[PDB]
């Protein structure tokens, strides 16, 4: 038992399955996404209370929460646009257009000093091996600064992330790739290949010297950020880790959701990691070399595929958010000891 369990609440005001649920940097607030277009923001310490809803009439791919103004969300549809959306004020502040012919807003990453984001930006899917691009921009002017050149050839990134002091950007795209970007020479730093198949999700180590991926695979990765395309360490995970996730009943009908949203999270120090299954978010102990993967913990309480989670950690105690096809998204309040 490295953790206790204190509880396990339900928000159960999405109808559709979720497509991304994330805790603001203030530790204090849910934004969740389901595959109709509505968008929620809720409070859940000490109950659950909803403090925006609002339907979409575009497609919403994306979400991410800005760093330095707690109350702004971004928000990327499948139509080319980012929207700055005021949770306080319940009101989109303005929605930009991406002069270009790649509606799909992939991914948002907001810098951590907050004075830029990046978002991913693809070409309609024929699978999703299709042409995309990563753009930068200025939060205080929001308007796009430069575009990254993509090698061989542009193509949809899936998945973003900063390191602590925003100096480095890491990247897994649709053919596979990690694409590591240094962000004050506008560079790509180093690149390998990752997994078969896309990348769904990368992150920085706590220590900053790996990267962690997931991909279409099965496999979770760790990399040596100091030397490309050196594995640190490799792990099969079960199946419904990653999908696809898949609904039935009875009568010839399913539904089948792609990852789209994070499929790990991870604990203040990063040595404790998240993951979906059929059933529940399953956590492991990182840090291992040993030969299988050390699970730890299953928090449970999902009678549908859990499709995304996150984990987030304050007043020295740890909220994970576990999101199922149902729609259901179960807050699990942990104390590590
Ligand atoms: C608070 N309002 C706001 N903030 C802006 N940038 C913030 C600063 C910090 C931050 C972070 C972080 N961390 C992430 C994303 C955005 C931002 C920019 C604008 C803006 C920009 C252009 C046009 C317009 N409008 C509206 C009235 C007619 C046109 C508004 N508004």
Redo the contacts with the bound molecule.
């Keep these: 038992q490295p953790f206790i369990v204190l509880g396990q609440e339900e928000y159960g005001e999405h109808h559709s399955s979720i497509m991304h649920c994330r805790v603001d940097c203030s530790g204090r607030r849910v934004a969740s996404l389901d595959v109709d277009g509505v968008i929620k923001v809720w409070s859940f310490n000490p109950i659950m209370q909803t403090k925006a809803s609002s339907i979409s009439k575009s497609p919403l791919l994306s979400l991410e929460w800005?760093?330095?103004?707690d109350r702004?969300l971004?928000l990327g549809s499948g139509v080319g646009t980012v929207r700055?959306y005021?949770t306080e004020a319940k009101k989109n502040?303005?929605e930009i257009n991406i002069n270009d012919n790649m509606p799909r807003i992939l991914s948002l990453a907001?810098s951590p000093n907050?004075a830029s984001?990046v978002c991913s930006a693809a070409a309609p899917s024929l699978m999703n091996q299709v042409p995309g691009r990563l753009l930068l921009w200025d939060?205080?002017?929001?308007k796009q600064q430069l575009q990254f050149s993509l090698d061989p050839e542009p193509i949809a990134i899936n998945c973003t992330a900063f390191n602590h002091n925003g100096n480095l950007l890491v990247t897994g795209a649709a053919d596979g790739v990690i694409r590591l970007f240094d962000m004050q020479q506008h560079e790509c730093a180093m690149s390998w290949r990752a997994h078969y198949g896309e990348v769904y999700s990368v992150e920085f180590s706590y220590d900053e010297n790996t990267v962690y991926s997931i991909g279409e695979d099965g496999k979770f990765i760790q990399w040596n950020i100091h030397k490309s395309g050196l594995k640190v360490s490799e792990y099969s995970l079960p199946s419904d880790a990653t999908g696809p996730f898949v609904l039935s009943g009875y009568s010839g009908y399913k539904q089948v959701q792609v990852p789209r949203g994070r499929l790990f999270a991870f604990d203040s120090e990063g040595n404790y990691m998240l993951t979906c299954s059929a059933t529940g978010g399953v956590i492991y102990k990182l840090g291992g070399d040993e030969k299988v993967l050390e699970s730890c913990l299953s928090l449970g309480g999902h009678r549908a595929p859990v499709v995304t989670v996150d984990w987030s950690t304050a007043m020295d105690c740890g909220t994970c958010l576990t999101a199922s096809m149902d729609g259901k998204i179960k807050l699990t309040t942990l104390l590590a000891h």
């Design positions: 800005a760093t330095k103004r702004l971004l700055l005021d502040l303005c907001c907050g984001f939060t205080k002017t929001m």
